[PDB]
Amino acid sequence: QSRSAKAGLTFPVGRVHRLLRRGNYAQRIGSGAPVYLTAVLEYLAAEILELAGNAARDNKKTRIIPRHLQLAIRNDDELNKLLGNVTIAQGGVLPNI
DNA sequence: ATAAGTCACATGGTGCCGAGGCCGCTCAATTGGTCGTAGACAGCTCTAGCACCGCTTAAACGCACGTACGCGCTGTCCCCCGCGTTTTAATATTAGTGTATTTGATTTCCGAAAGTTAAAA
């Protein structure tokens, strides 16, 4: 058995734990912190990737592309607050009317 | 006359009172010393650079020029406010209670560390 396996999360929480270790965020790394934040990250990735799926459906290209990613993330009004100053590579910009 | 004796004198010394003079304890962080490991290094090879030509014709710049366009124009509408006024609510005072913080003594908490081994392109 593995900690990354029993976590039931895609991203390996062991990697997150040791990243927190070398990241100097504190002297001890609470074992629930990496798994919790890994799950939060996985949900946010799920948001981006269900947007990817429906953008692939809308644009008829089965595999998601950065244009679709930029368009969907810029249409995500609440998420743009998190990613306001953020910008995406090769994504262009959403059309202004 | 002089051994005994009283006596006062003279110096002894013992006791108590400050007091200025050394001393005692503690914690800052230095520096002394010492392990063990980041750091610069030791041969090195090959990456993606960046020329270094050697083409082509796709951009592009000017050549022309044209509506679009701007930019003040100009009657006039309008609105902001400078006050003048009544309001009007902003002072800024006490207040004790009602948690809010809070700082002790633990007292569990738990993950870094030390094995031991699972897994891993």
Q: Please count the other Cβ atoms lying within 10 Å of the Cβ belonging to residue A13.
A: 25
Strand B closer than 7 A to residue A27 Cβ = yes
Give the torsion through C-alpha atoms of A75, A87, A9, A47, to 10 deg: 0
Beta carbons of A45 and A16 less than 8 angstroms apart:
no
Q: What's the resolution in A?
A: 3.4
Q: Which domain CATH number covers A43?
A: 1.10.20.10
Residues 6+ apart with CB under 8 A from A89: A66
Interatomic distance A53 CA / B25 C1' (Å): 77
The single-letter DSSP state of residue A1 is -
Tell me which method was used to determine the 3D structure. Answer: cryo-EM
Let me know if residue A45 belongs to a domain.
Answer: yes
Let me know if residue A73 belongs to a domain.
Answer: yes
Strand B closer than 7 A to residue A29 Cβ = yes
Let me know if residue A97 belongs to a domain.
Answer: no
Residues 6+ apart with CB under 8 A from A57: none
Let me know if residue A74 belongs to a domain.
Answer: yes
Let me know if residue A27 belongs to a domain.
Answer: yes
Let me know if residue A56 belongs to a domain.
Answer: yes
Q: Which nucleotides along chain B are within 7 A of a protein C-beta?
A: 110-112, 118-120
Angle between helices A13-22 and A32-59 (to 10 degrees): 120
Let me know if residue A94 belongs to a domain.
Answer: no
Q: Please count the other Cβ atoms lying within 10 Å of the Cβ belonging to residue A39.
A: 16
Q: How many domains does chain A have?
A: 1
Residue A21's domain comprises: 1-86
Let me know if residue A63 belongs to a domain.
Answer: yes
Residue A67 phi/psi, 5-degree rounding, is -60, -50
Q: Which tokens go with A58?
A: 């809308």
Strand B closer than 7 A to residue A32 Cβ = yes
Residue A51 phi/psi, 5-degree rounding, is -60, -40
Beta carbons of A34 and A17 less than 8 angstroms apart:
yes
